[PDB]
Amino acid sequence: NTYRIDRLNTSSVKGRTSGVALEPTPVRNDKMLIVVDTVLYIRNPIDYQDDWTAP
Amino acid sequence: NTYRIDRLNTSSVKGRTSGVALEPTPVRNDKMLIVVDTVLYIRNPIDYQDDWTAP
Amino acid sequence: NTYRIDRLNTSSVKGRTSGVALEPTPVRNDKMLIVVDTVLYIRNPIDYQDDWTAP
Amino acid sequence: TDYAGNLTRPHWGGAASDVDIHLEVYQNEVDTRFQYQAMFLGLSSQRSVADRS
């Protein structure tokens, strides 16, 4: 009854000239849940006798 | 729903001397009954929503 | 980091005789999770020069 | 509770369908006793005196 969409972040951009070491960065993520809870409905009873004598 | 099995008894040996009457003895009987009158059952209703949201 | 196994219960046999209504019963359930945490390791480095000079 | 008090009970014949009149399913079996066989026929000495004394 649940569906999951996984979020995720972005990362910046750097600049390295000639021998400068490269610096890593992390990215963060989360989750999302959509939970189905209730039902929609509509019920229409028609008697046999009324059904017999009507289109 | 019933079932019948008959039962039967036994006679007893008795002694006699010269002019003595042979006493007649009855052999009793009866019947036995087995009657089915109870319905064992299991009743497990699963709702539609739980069916639609679970294997 | 996870692994799921579902569980289930039993039902209770009940008795009806001639015209009584059957009484439904539910069946409870649960689950269990197994989680992987750590990684085992063995790391033996060998220098080039020692490998070049020993079997 | 109950389902319906108006049933067409087959072999319950009364003003309220209460007294049982089902036909007793009978197979021709009757149990009487467990038989016994004498063994002292050969554990003695038979000496008939019939019609003599």
Q: Which residue of B has its CA nearest to A39?
A: B49
Task: Specify the DSSP element, H or E, that contains A31.
Answer: strand A31-35
Q: Inter-chain contact B53–A36, Cβ cutoff 8 Å?
A: yes
Q: Inter-chain contact B41–C17, Cβ cutoff 8 Å?
A: no
What is the rounded distance in angstroms from the CA atom of residue A33 to the CA atom of residue B25?
A: 90
| Residue C19 in contact with partner chain D when CB distance is under 8 A | yes
Q: Are A36 and B53 in contact (CB under 8 A)?
A: yes
The residue written with tokens 């009743």 in the block is B43
What is the rounded distance in angstroms from the CA atom of residue C6 to the CA atom of residue C30?
A: 6
| Residue A36 in contact with partner chain B when CB distance is under 8 A | yes
What is the rounded distance in angstroms from the CA atom of residue D48 to the CA atom of residue D38?
A: 18
For residue B48, list chain A residues with Cβ-Cβ distance below 8 A: 39
| Residue B34 in contact with partner chain D when CB distance is under 8 A | no
Task: Specify the DSSP element, H or E, that contains C48.
Answer: helix C48-52
Q: Which residue of D has its CA nearest to C23?
A: D1
Q: Do chains B and C touch (3 or more CB pairs under 8 A)?
A: yes
The residue written with tokens 């089915």 in the block is B36
What is the rounded distance in angstroms from the CA atom of residue C38 to the CA atom of residue C46?
A: 26
Nearest-5° Cα angle at C15, C10 to C16: 135
- Number of CB atoms found within 10 A of residue B42's CB: 13
Structural determination approach: cryo-EM
Q: What resolution (Å)?
A: 3.3
Backbone φ and ψ for D40, nearest 5 degrees, come out as -80, 15
Breaks in chain B (C–N > 2.5 Å) following residue: none
What is the rounded distance in angstroms from the CA atom of residue B36 to the CA atom of residue C18?
A: 11
The SS3 assignment for D8 reads coil
Q: Provide the chain D residues 5-44 that lie in CB contact (below 8 A) with chain B.
A: 20, 22-26, 29-33
What is the rounded distance in angstroms from the CA atom of residue D45 to the CA atom of residue D37?
A: 18
Q: Are D12 and D21 in contact (CB under 8 A)?
A: yes
Tokens representing D53?
A: 């004394």
Q: Inter-chain contact B8–D24, Cβ cutoff 8 Å?
A: no
| Residue B47 in contact with partner chain A when CB distance is under 8 A | no
What is the rounded distance in angstroms from the CA atom of residue B18 to the CA atom of residue A5?
A: 112
What is the rounded distance in angstroms from the CA atom of residue C34 to the CA atom of residue B29?
A: 70
Name which of B1, B37, B41, B46 to mutate to probe chain C: the one with the most chain C Cβ atoms within 10 A of its Cβ. Answer: B41
